[PDB]
């Protein structure tokens with residue numbers, strides 16, 4: 001589902017990409033070949049969000065920005081294949097669990113769960129929450145991974 005009573009303003013700011021689960025080997029491999037620094041969530045010039053991710057690739061700092069357009073309900077967004085992105089659960093000041101699925105085109109084959117943490121190294125219980133969520137969503141244990149982090153690029 002989507003986080004009930006989702007408050008976008010409390011979801012803004014700095015998050016760390018701590019955990020990932022995907023049914024795409026290509027995407028898993030791509031993400032694992034990098035080191036995550038931080039992500040920043042900010043309101044876009046429309047009712048959606050800009051998600052700016054900073055990471056290290058071959059010792060080079062890089063950034064990518066993703067526009068998450070509103071999808072007609074709070075906590076639900078769209079990214080253009082087209083993908084649905086949902087904030088399924090969050091307490092705003094510790095963690096957020098995101099879920100993405102293709103909604104149009106070949107991307108429909110694609111599913112991804114993400115654990116965002118307000119701290120770069122998340123508590124063990126946060127990791128358990130994520131694993132439990134991924135298992136509930138039909139991800140195999142081997143696809144549930146915690147991404148390499150970097151202190152650089154901050």
Ligand SMILES: CCCCCCCC/C=C\CCCCCCCC(=O)O
Pocket residue numbers: 027030031034053054055064065066067112
């Ligand atoms: C608009 C897309 C921007 C994605 C930036 C995400 C930052 C993660 C680091 C490297 C991305 C390389 C993998 C390509 C798949 C897109 C990742 C995703 O689902 O967010």
Ligand SMILES: CCCCCCCCCCCCCCCC(=O)O
Pocket residue numbers: 024026027051066079083085098100106107108109110112114
């Ligand atoms: C962290 C914010 C989530 C962003 C939502 C977009 C997720 C990924 C979109 C690119 C998918 C590329 C995967 C190709 C694999 C396949 O289609 O089988």
